[PDB]
Design a binder for these strands. Structure first.
Ligand SMILES: Cc1cc2c(cc1C)N(C[C@H](O)[C@H](O)[C@H](O)COP(=O)(O)OP(=O)(O)OC[C@H]1O[C@@H](n3cnc4c(N)ncnc43)[C@H](O)[C@@H]1O)c1[nH]c(=O)[nH]c(=O)c1N2
Length: 460
DNA sequence: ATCGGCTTCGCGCA
DNA sequence: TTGCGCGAAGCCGA
């Protein structure tokens, strides 16, 4: 009934006479969720209800109010969404490995389902969970069109080798979603406290302007499943046609803007591809866009899955390692610390501008992110430091941060992963180089700089 | 084979 | 700002 290559058995065994509970984690949405549909499926063939369980963890302390509210404001809207289909959602606070354990016990779950994520800490949690349960345990890729473990059984060296695999698998996986049928059988803190608690927890780290005013502008992106869908519709109707020709222009904003929604799972990219595919646009712009949400977004999962040190210098390709190592003792033009990068006090004002876009909006322009990471590698004392600075700023300040897409982007920029070797230079070696004067022939750099000049002088 | 083609490069010049 | 060919560069896969 559903394509069963989207399921992997974690733990086998006997079905409890209790509810089917979805350990929701990555795909925080009620529609177009292959994982919650699997849950409803084996629930219905069991005459049991489905419930959903979410577990909140101290990981929010590692980022910002901006993300925590994006996720929490979302989950309030999910709660109404599930409840109106008779699906209870329960919200746990703590370590999954040992609270999902207690839950499975306290409620005698018939079976357990979770979505798929390649992040290391999730594979730790699944382990702590299996060790402590005896009921079955399933994982479902609800996040990729083509399940990650089916797309490829190895690390793909680049897109041109991955892309033929994905598209061969595409006609059998690109399909429509079925309706989420409500519970036939009507079947731990409240959500409002966790929001306010967390906020009081994070306020003293809040980026403030020099006049105590918060730096973040929460209005560029309304959180939520509802909201996500208006973003994609308006993008397919207004911006898709221009995506190819205007995407590399930080002065326009012809991006789809879906990445904070995708990251928190508030929208499936399968619904997106689906709607794009029937859309009558420029074939140029579709291909470019399909390629970003399909090849690049998914090889970003393949990356982390097959490379446990996805955030490490060790996961760069051999040639990139030799090159950067050969240039470790090169004199650097400038050397900034994390904090000088952080507050945009470099000599480059294009760079500082993108540091200001990231600080205030929560979302740096896809093209600028690539310049940003490279001038970090140029102006830091070592690669490993460069890498560690760009991760830290990516996850602290991007709304889409803490994401497979993030590590594999940084790897690309600093370490050449999924890229190729270019003319050898000082410091950066054979890693692909970008310049301010290459930026000038592509967009009106002065316009970008002008937009974010009013922040730097009043940052501290 | 073994060779072309490779996300998002820079640069000069029309 | 446009595009177009060339440049330096390591390596996958048909
Ligand atoms: C230095 C640096 C740092 C990061 C990233 C790249 C670079 C160069 N990326 C990837 C990319 O920059 C990001 O996905 C886009 O900016 C998404 O913004 P839009 O949704 O507007 O993209 P746009 O509308 O152009 O593309 C649509 C979608 O395609 C996918 N996509 C586009 N560019 C991609 C890329 N380079 N890699 C993978 N998937 C891509 C994403 O799902 C994106 O939502 C990333 N992404 C992310 O979600 N979180 C992050 O924290 C980072 N970090």
């Amino acid at each position: 009934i559903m394509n069963p290559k989207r399921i992997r058995a974690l733990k086998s065994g006997k079905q409890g006479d209790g509810p089917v509970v979805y350990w929701m984690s990555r795909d925080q949405r009620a529609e177009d969720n292959w994982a919650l549909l699997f849950s409803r499926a084996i629930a219905k063939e069991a005459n049991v209800p489905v419930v959903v369980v979410f577990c909140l963890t101290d990981e929010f302390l590692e980022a910002g109010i901006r993300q925590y509210e994006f996720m929490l404001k979302g989950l309030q809207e999910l709660e109404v969404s599930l409840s109106r289909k008779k699906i209870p959602s329960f919200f746990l606070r703590g370590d999954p490995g040992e609270k999902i354990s207690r839950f499975v016990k306290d409620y005698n779950a018939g079976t357990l389902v979770t979505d798929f994520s390649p992040l290391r800490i999730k594979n730790q949690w699944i382990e702590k969970v299996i060790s402590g349960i005896s009921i079955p345990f399933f994982e479902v890729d609800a996040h990729n069109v083509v399940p990650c473990w089916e797309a490829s059984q190895k690390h793909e060296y680049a897109a041109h080798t991955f892309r033929p695999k994905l598209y061969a698998l595409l006609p059998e996986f690109l399909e429509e979603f079925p309706e989420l049928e409500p519970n036939s059988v009507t079947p731990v803190e409240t959500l409002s406290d966790v929001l306010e608690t967390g906020v009081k927890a994070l306020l003293p780290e809040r980026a403030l302007l020099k006049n105590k005013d918060p730096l973040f502008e929460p209005w560029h992106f309304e959180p939520g499943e509802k909201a996500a869908k208006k973003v994609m519709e308006s993008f397919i109707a207004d911006r898709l046609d221009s995506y190819g020709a205007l995407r590399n222009d930080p002065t326009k904003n012809m991006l789809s803007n879906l990445s904070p929604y995708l990251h928190f799972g508030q929208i499936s990219s399968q619904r997106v591809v689906l709607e794009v595919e029937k859309a009558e646009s420029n074939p140029g712009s579709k291909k470019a866009f399909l390629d970003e949400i399909l090849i690049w977004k998914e090889i970003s999962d393949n990356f982390c899955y097959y490379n446990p040190g996805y955030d490490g210098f060790e996961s760069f390709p051999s040639w990139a390692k030799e090159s950067l190592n050969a240039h470790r003792n090169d004199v650097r033009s400038h050397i900034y610390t994390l904090e000088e990068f952080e507050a945009g006090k470099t000599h480059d004002p294009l760079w500082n501008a993108s540091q200001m876009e990231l600080l205030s909006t929560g979302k740096m322009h896809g093209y600028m992110r690539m310049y940003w990471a490279k001038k970090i590698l140029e102006w830091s004392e070592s690669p490993e430091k460069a890498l560690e600075i760009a991760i830290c700023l990516n996850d602290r300040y991007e709304l889409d941060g803490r994401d497979p897409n993030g590590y594999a982007g940084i790897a690309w920029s600093i370490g050449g992963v999924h890229d190729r070797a270019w003319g050898e230079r000082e410091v950066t070696g054979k890693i692909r180089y970008m310049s301010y004067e290459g930026c000038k022939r592509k967009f009106d750099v002065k316009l970008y700089i002008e937009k974010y000049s009013a922040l730097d002088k009043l940052a501290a």
